[PDB]
Paper text:
In Xenopus eggs, [name] replaces sperm protamines with core histones upon fertilization, thereby promoting nucleosome assembly on sperm DNA Laskey et al., 1978; Philpott et al., 1991; Ohsumi and Katagiri, 1991. [name] can also extract out somatic linker histones from chromatin Dimitrov and Wolffe, 1996; Ramos et al., 2005; Bañuelos et al., 2007. The acidic tracts in the C-terminal tail of [name] binds H2A-H2B, histone octamers, and the linker histone H5 Platonova et al., 2011; Ramos et al., 2010; Taneva et al., 2009, while poly-glutamylation and hyperphosphorylation of [name] promote its substrate sequestration ; Lorton et al., 2023. Our cryo-EM structure strongly suggests that the [name] binds to H1.8 as a homo-pentamer.
3D DuSTER enabled the reconstruction of 3D structure of the interphase-specific H1.8-containing complex, a pentameric macromolecule with a diameter of approximately 60 Å. C5 symmetry was applied during structural reconstruction. Among the proteins detected by MS, [name] aligned well with the [name]-cryo-EM result. In addition, the crystal structure and AlphaFold2 (AF2)-predicted models of Xenopus [name] matched the [name]-cryo-EM structure of the interphase-specific H1.8-bound complex Dutta et al., 2001. By combining [name]-cryo-EM and DuSTER, we were able to determine the sub-nanometer structure and structural variations of the [name]-H1.8-GFP complex, in which the mass of the ordered region is only 60 kDa. One possibility is that the H1.8 structure in [name]-H1.8 does not follow C5 symmetry. As the size of the [name]-H1.8 complex estimated from sucrose gradient elution volume is consistent with pentameric [name] binding to a single H1.8, applying C5 symmetry during structural reconstruction likely blurred the density of the monomeric H1.8 that binds to the [name] pentamer. The structural determination of [name]-H1.8 without applying C5 symmetry lowered the overall resolution but visualized multiple structural variants of the [name] protomer with different degrees of openness co-existing within an [name]-H1.8 complex, raising a possibility that opening of a portion of the [name] pentamer may affect modes of H1.8 binding. While DuSTER enables the structural analysis of [name] co-isolated with H1.8-GFP, the resulting map quality is modest, and the reported numerical resolution may be overestimated.
Author numbering:
A (entry chain B), B (entry chain A), C (entry chain E), D (entry chain D), E (entry chain C): 16 to 125
The structure:
């Protein structure tokens, strides 16, 4: 369980949890823990979602909704991602920081 | 675990998590994760429930209650649905978006 | 897991989760999920508790405390009741609706 | 799982979860569930902790922090005590009620 | 499960969960439970994080964000640390108290 974090904002509205092609050989995940508003986040309900594809029709996984006045930070426990997995802001301007741990296995290279 | 979402509102007060009859042959579920108020949701306590039937007397499963000022979004973890399962708004006007993952198994069609 | 709900208020200050004597033969439970204030609930901290008996001295299990302005609804996860189990309002006027699922096993009556 | 509750306040700043010496022969616990402010609690952040001893240097286990305006009640799930275990108010005046279930095993005395 | 707590503030912006080299021989952890603002904490969103190192590029694990007016205290359940693990305040002035239990095994020294 290496440890992972990123942000989504108007400057980084989209992101991606992707593991290196060499590293992707193993089973890799990203077990998310928390999502917290950034310093430049607007006072509105910013929504973090995932972008993927199903049956050719565009789709996304809503992850969280945050607002500094009510819910600036929430616990994203029970949410895991199998890389590659795109990140997007369904709503808001960010920065919405997403935390977690990149679960990655490594072979014996000794 | 394909990934799933819908909304309930005055325009869609009722919905249903149903898997296709061909797909229903396998064990299908919908493990819910979160429920979040929509952009057009009223500032009141909107309640999301499920509609089913027991012993011929009408019944529903209350899923969540949300309000933009207090609890616009909640985590619907530990809630799973076996399709078909109707959705309804016990109270409110919506849109109340319900998230989750449609757990579906597929046979080898190669 | 049949599904269950009730309310406690000045009209129903006390209630009971009881399974029928014929049904009680099996192991029956009521896994609670959520507790939500009713439409007629006062703007105060209404407390839901259970009534039982220990060593002959009167006792109760506090389940929840709710207020429309702060915590109108809470998740009563991890709380399970073995029938019969009385319900009472430690404080408040209700209606405080208690949700859950009545876990009940049935024999083969074919 | 017998069921347990107590309060800590200026009148009862300290308490203890202790099982009777005769009962202590078995493995006894107190799985805590919730902590809620009392009727006489002040509008400040009252902190509930445990008192014990380690390596001869005084120590305590902070359990919770509550305030009527923000967090009058919280879920103390995942917290278990092995009796005897002293209770104290790290901060506040109480009453802070602590809930739970005293898990106790009994031999066959028939 | 010995029991553990510390604080991070302008006076202690950095800390560390480290087990003694003699004690480190066994598998040691620190299962965190809660994080609560101190008496001298400013009315802003103080962020607690961990400091470590990955692939030579500096990094940290954000643990929590707290504010007395909204979220003075939160439950840090599901978070565990393998010593040594540095603590830092990503934002804020503290004191932000971090609770938990130091899980430590000891050999038979009789």
């Amino acid at each position: 369980s290496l440890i992972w974090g990123c942000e989504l904002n108007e400057q980084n509205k989209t992101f991606e949890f992707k593991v290196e092609d060499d590293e992707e050989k193993c089973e890799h995940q990203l077990a998310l823990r928390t999502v917290c508003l950034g310093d430049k986040a607007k006072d509105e309900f910013h929504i973090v979602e995932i972008v993927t594809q199903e049956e050719g029709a565009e789709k996304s996984v809503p992850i969280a909704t945050l607002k500094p006045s009510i819910l600036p930070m929430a616990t994203m426990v029970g949410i895991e991602l199998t890389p590659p997995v795109t990140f997007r802001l369904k709503a808001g301007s960010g920065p919405l920081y997403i935390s977690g741990q990149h679960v990655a296995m490594e072979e014996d290279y000794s």
